[PDB]
Amino acid sequence: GSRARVYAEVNSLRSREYWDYEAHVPSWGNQDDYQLVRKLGRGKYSEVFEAINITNNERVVVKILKPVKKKKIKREVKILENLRGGTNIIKLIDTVKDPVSKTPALVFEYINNTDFKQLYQILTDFDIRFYMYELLKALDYCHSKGIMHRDVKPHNVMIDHQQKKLRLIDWGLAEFYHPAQEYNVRVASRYFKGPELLVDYQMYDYSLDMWSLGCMLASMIFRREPFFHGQDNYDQLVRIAKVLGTEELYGYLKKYHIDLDPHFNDILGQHSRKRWENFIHSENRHLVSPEALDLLDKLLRYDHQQRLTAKEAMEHPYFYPVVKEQS
Ligand SMILES: Brc1cc2[nH]nnc2nc1Br
Ligand SMILES: [Cl-]
Ligand SMILES: [Cl-]
Ligand code: NA
């Protein structure tokens, strides 16, 4: 079967307690120290608030969890505690419970983010390189810690464009990578799902996040957000195949012995692989360079095992201007 080219055995080389999140026993502090100020968002299993820690007057974010999902709560807590101190990973400050109802909540550092729909319209060439480099640091870190994020998308990459701070958030879908483990493919936002998920290939790895990152890079340099805009999960693969080509898709499926849902027969059609230069026009030409296209071409590949790792991406010439400035 398939396995990760990097970090494959990292969890098996650690203590079982590192990855055995079902056995994790969080230390639950008291939510009464936090005053909710404003609702920021809501999801299937959580609600998120700006809040003040009344004991030190610090602004924080509080994510209240539906208490029923106990295994999933332990998973997210253990992952966040394993990632503590990681570069550009949102900092978990506290794990707390309502002292009466025992409903759990996660307390995070606050970040004053610029909404990505507004931000992505004004980014410069250097800004894209800079923020992509910072996001890659977060993914290289979590991958090196044996963790797949599985929900990389603009909404989960919080950017304070005034202070130049980036944090990868929402670790509620993240999982530990173990070689040969078969994972649930119902992860990531539709537009950021790797082809492996869309063809029901369960033996995926950290390289899933690299597809999602490539999708973000393409949306930022080309100013088409989201870049692959499917109407459902079937159409999502069609949108990908329109660009990467159908014959290349079939070679991928053959290599991994992947059976294709026969509903694809009536919708995939026949598509050449397109040159990435086809996406350039006057509105995006200043964000596109040969080095951007070379990097993107090495991320948005069907074959998950041939996509760049986060580290290989960081090492690409596209980021040399950022590395030099950070000197
Ligand atoms: Br900070 C922060 C952390 C999160 N984790 N999951 N959702 C989140 N939202 C915000 Br805002
Ligand atoms: Cl899973
Ligand atoms: Cl297209
Ligand atoms: Na409280």
Curated annotation (Swiss-Prot):
Lineage of the organism? Eukaryota, Metazoa, Chordata, Craniata, Vertebrata
* Quaternary structure, from the entry: Heterotetramer composed of two catalytic subunits (alpha chain and/or alpha' chain) and two regulatory subunits (beta chains). The tetramer can exist as a combination of 2 alpha/2 beta, 2 alpha'/2 beta or 1 alpha/1 alpha'/2 beta subunits. Also part of a CK2-SPT16-SSRP1 complex composed of SSRP1, SUPT16H, CSNK2A1, CSNK2A2 and CSNK2B, which forms following UV irradiation. Interacts with CSNK2A2IP (via C-terminus). Interacts with SIRT6; preventing CSNK2A2 localization to the nucleus. Interacts with RNPS1. Interacts with HIRIP3.
- Tell me its EC number(s), please: 2.7.11.1
* List of residues that carry Phosphoserine: S12, S15, S282
Which PANTHER family does this chain map to? CASEIN KINASE II SUBUNIT ALPHA
Q: Which residues carry this modification: N6-acetyllysine?
A: K91
Keywords, sorted A to Z:
Acetylation, Apoptosis, ATP-binding, Cell cycle, Cytoplasm, Kinase, Nucleotide-binding, Nucleus, Phosphoprotein, Serine/threonine-protein kinase, Transcription, Transcription regulation, Transferase, Wnt signaling pathway
Q: Where in the cell is it found?
A: Nucleus; Cytoplasm
Does Transcription regulation show up as a keyword for this record? yes
Which SMART domains did the record assign? S_TKc
Gene Ontology biological process terms in this record: apoptotic process; cerebral cortex development; DNA damage response; double-strand break repair; liver regeneration; negative regulation of apoptotic signaling pathway; negative regulation of proteasomal ubiquitin-dependent protein catabolic process; positive regulation of protein targeting to mitochondrion
Q: What is this protein called?
A: Casein kinase II subunit alpha'
List the InterPro entries hit by this protein, alphabetically. Answer: CK2_alpha, Kinase-like_dom_sf, Prot_kinase_dom, Protein_kinase_ATP_BS, Ser/Thr_kinase_AS
Recorded GO molecular functions are:
ATP binding; protein serine kinase activity; protein serine/threonine kinase activity
What's the name of its gene?
A: CSNK2A2
